Amino acid sequence: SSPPVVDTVHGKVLGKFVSLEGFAQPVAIFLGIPFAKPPLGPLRFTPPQPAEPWSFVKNATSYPPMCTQDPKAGQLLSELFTNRKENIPLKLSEDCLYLNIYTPADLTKKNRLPVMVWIHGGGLMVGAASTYDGLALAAHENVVVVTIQYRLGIWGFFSTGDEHSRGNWGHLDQVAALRWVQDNIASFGGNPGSVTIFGESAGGESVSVLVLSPLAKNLFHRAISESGVALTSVLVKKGDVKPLAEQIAITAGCKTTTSAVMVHCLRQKTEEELLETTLKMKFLSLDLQGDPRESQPLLGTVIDGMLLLKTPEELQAERNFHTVPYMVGINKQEFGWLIPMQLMSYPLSEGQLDQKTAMSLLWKSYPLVCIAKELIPEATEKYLGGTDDTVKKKDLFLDLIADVMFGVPSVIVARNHRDAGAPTYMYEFQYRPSFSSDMKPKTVIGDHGDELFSVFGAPFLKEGASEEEIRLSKMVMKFWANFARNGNPNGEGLPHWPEYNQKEGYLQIGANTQAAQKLKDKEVAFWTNLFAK
Ligand SMILES: *[C@@](O)(c1ccccc1Cl)C(F)(F)F
């Protein structure tokens, strides 16, 4: 019964025990541990500072707020992605730099378990750590699971393109959480010499950015990007970021006289005024009015000169990144339902698409796929021209967006990582979880986020999982935690997962799981040639 109490650098923390049926050792859970000073007032749009130390024992048994964000979209994504039986309602706050810890170690003995640090998705605009319950993965695989938060949206990524607001505050928060883990996780039974970062969607892009950042040197030892990398271009702003900053300033009621003037004005706004600004900007929603080249669907990663010194393409060309073991994976249908239908309000209710509407829509999709207008016909013809059925054309259009956004970027990242001599692994995930939304057509399989339910052991926390689904989660969890332990997912009882080498082996994960070769090879060739003009 007696709750666990752990000493950290900054003070003592009190957690709680939670048992998972069939595991003798209850899991010690610590909710809402601060890893930075709350980024309020003048600390807005600045790097995170260390948390101030506290006397006595901090009660770490309540979920922290989630970072300020569109509450409706944030709650929706939490409901769609959570592995728990009931979604936990969360408060909003700028005071959100917290992490949650699930340790299966008996804290009365000494333990050095591998640590897995989860970075949540959400487009860099929404999301929360508390969505993801670490209980099942921690108990089933004997790993310490850490879920982190980081500033989002305007708070996390507002950039003037210069020294007055460089940008990438949320990525700096991720780095601060990893340094906290280095300094403290051994008190929770974890091994700071074996930290694996893993994340999905914008969280997978964050993992890829951290692989590219000198600030993350020696903070992690393996990495996993699930459905998102630093070549997912909608998340990485190149070129001139000043137009977006000025539009944000104006919407908030601020002058644009200079960068410093904009940033100081935004620093005086209340949280509520910046949230009103966020909602007026209509982020994460396909912009159908005006020139598509001016659409800004999210505030994201920039080349700031501190976290990222050059573009991801330039960094991989010079082999300037952390050559840790790296697992890069995609799902069979990344654009099948949840991103267009639930997050971005795509005009695809009809379920048939003719080629003319497809070209018009692909042009409107410019902020996602970056295809010049003169190249829209060729691109569309390559995917939709081979059939005459317009339902098939709609499905092939979804394939096209998925390949440009996720599949091709992921293979290019994996190839460049392999070519720097690092151990590299890839997967393609194909399963339709029973936990899918009731709104989701039964023909969508391997949608964006579908692997989450297997990675986080949803069949052991939510009800109604089939026996096949339970088996799948046990295998995925074991692959992931073997990778955390050894930088190699393989082990006894598991299908062989080849290294992604020059033969380009990868694992097809699903009801039938087996190795395959050359993922997306034809598509990479096509799109690389197309984007070279
Ligand atoms: C992902 O973070 C996401 C959302 C929108 C665009 C791109 C990406 Cl990677 C989410 F939200 F989980 F789907």
Numbering used by the authors: 4 to 536
Provide the authors' original text about this structure:
Human carboxylesterase 1A (hCES1A) was employed as a target enzyme for inhibitory activity (IC50) screening due to its conservative catalytic serine residue. By the analysis of X-ray crystal structure, human CES1A has a serine esterase catalytic triad (Ser-221, His-468, and Glu-354), such catalytic triad is conserved in all mammalian species.. Herein, the halogen effects on the reactivity of the halogenated 2,2,2-trifluoroacetophenones as serine-targeting covalent warheads were investigated. Our results showed that introducing halogen atoms, especially Cl or Br, into the phenyl scaffold would influence the electron density around the ring, which led to different time-dependent inhibition response to the target serine hydrolase (hCES1A).
Surprisingly, dichloro-substituted analogues F-4 deriving from analogues F-1 and F-2 exhibited more promising contribution than monosubstituted analogues, but introducing three chloride atoms into the ring was not tolerated perhaps due to their enhanced passivation effect. The covalent interactions were evaluated by nano LC-MS/MS, which offered powerful evidence to support the formation of the covalent adducts and well-explained the time-dependent inhibition of these covalent fragments. Chloro-species compounds F-3 and F-4 were chosen to detect their covalent binding sites on hCES1A. Since the activity of electrophilic warheads and the formation of covalent adducts are related to temperature, we set the incubation conditions at two different temperature points (4 °C and 25°C, respectively). This analysis certainly found several allosteric binding sites, although no expected result of any compound covalently binding to Ser221 at the catalytic cavity of hCES1A. Successfully, the co-crystallography of hCES1A with F-3 and F-4 provided promising covalent binding modes at the catalytic triad. It could be obviously seen that the carbonyl group of F-4 was attacked by the oxygen of the OH group of Ser221, forming an expected hemiacetal covalent bond. The OH of the hemiacetal group introduced multiple hydrogen interactions with Gly143, Gly142 and Ala222 nearby, stabilising the formed hemiacetal adduct and favouring binding of the compound at this site. Notably, the co-crystallisation of the parent compound F and hCES1A failed to result in similar covalent interactions. This further proves that the halogen effect may promote the formation of covalent adducts by changing the sensitivity of the electrophilic warhead. The introduction of halogen atoms, particularly chlorine, into the phenyl scaffold enhances the benzocarbonyl reactivity in forming hemiacetal adducts with serine.
